[PDB]
Amino acid sequence: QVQLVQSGAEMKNPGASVKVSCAASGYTFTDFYIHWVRLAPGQGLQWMGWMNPKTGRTNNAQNFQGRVTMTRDTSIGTAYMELRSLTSDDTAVYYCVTGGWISLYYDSSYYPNFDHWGQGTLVTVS
């Protein structure tokens, strides 16, 4: 029932920015966080940032801080992430992942329950 359909392979040159989108269904989109993870070849899973679709707060790992920005719109129910200062090492597969459940009373951003995964986009540089 859950599905996160994503954009296509956004091949781009170094120096520019790459913007990926993942459209959500099944889950009530405002209820669950969206985390982002990256499979850089050679390296393992590499985590970029979370975003609260209900509030809009975002954070990034120190490798990505200041380099990644995110946005969405809850009516359509689609999520976006954009990466600045693209380079060759960013050639990787981006994956849009959701969970845990958002609450006003206990923080559950960092709770790494990547419940459902989108099919991917092959970002290639270049």
Ligand X SMILES: *[C@@H]1O[C@H](CO)[C@@H](O[C@@H]2O[C@H](CO)[C@@H](O[C@@H]3O[C@H](CO)[C@@H](O)[C@H](O[C@H]4O[C@H](CO)[C@@H](O)[C@H](O)[C@@H]4O[C@H]4O[C@H](CO)[C@@H](O)[C@H](O)[C@@H]4O[C@H]4O[C@H](CO)[C@@H](O)[C@H](O)[C@@H]4O)[C@@H]3O)[C@H](O)[C@H]2NC(C)=O)[C@H](O)[C@H]1NC(C)=O
Ligand Y SMILES: *[C@@H]1O[C@H](CO)[C@@H](O[C@@H]2O[C@H](CO)[C@@H](O[C@@H]3O[C@H](CO[C@H]4O[C@H](CO[C@H]5O[C@H](CO)[C@@H](O)[C@H](O)[C@@H]5O[C@H]5O[C@H](CO)[C@@H](O)[C@H](O)[C@@H]5O)[C@@H](O)[C@H](O[C@H]5O[C@H](CO)[C@@H](O)[C@H](O)[C@@H]5O[C@H]5O[C@H](CO)[C@@H](O)[C@H](O)[C@@H]5O)[C@@H]4O)[C@@H](O)[C@H](O[C@H]4O[C@H](CO)[C@@H](O)[C@H](O)[C@@H]4O[C@H]4O[C@H](CO)[C@@H](O)[C@H](O)[C@@H]4O[C@H]4O[C@H](CO)[C@@H](O)[C@H](O)[C@@H]4O)[C@@H]3O)[C@H](O)[C@H]2NC(C)=O)[C@H](O)[C@H]1NC(C)=O
Residues that bind ligand X (CB under 6 A): 15, 17, 66-67, 84-85
CB atoms within 10 A of CB 50: 19
CB atoms within 10 A of CB 41: 8
Stretch that binds ligand Y, among 16-24, 33-41, 89-97, 99-107 (CB under 6 A): 99-107
Helix (H) or strand (E) holding 96: strand 92-101
Q: From ligand X, ligand Y, other proteins, none, which one binds at residue 3 (CB under 5 to 8 Å depending on kind)?
A: none
Contacts with other proteins by CB under 8 A: the residue count is 35
Identify residue 77 by its one-letter amino acid code: G
Integer Cα distance of 126 and 90 in angstroms: 10
DSSP 8-state class, residue 89 = G
User: In the set 95, 121, 123, 125, which binds other proteins (CB under 8 A)?
Assistant: 95
For 94, phi then psi, to 5°, come to -95, 140
Q: Fill in the per-residue mask, 53 to 92: x = in contact with ligand Y (CB under 6 A), - = not in contact.
A: ----------------------------------------
Query: Which residues contact other proteins by CB under 8 A?
Result: 35, 37, 43-47, 50, 52, 55-57, 59-62, 95, 103-120
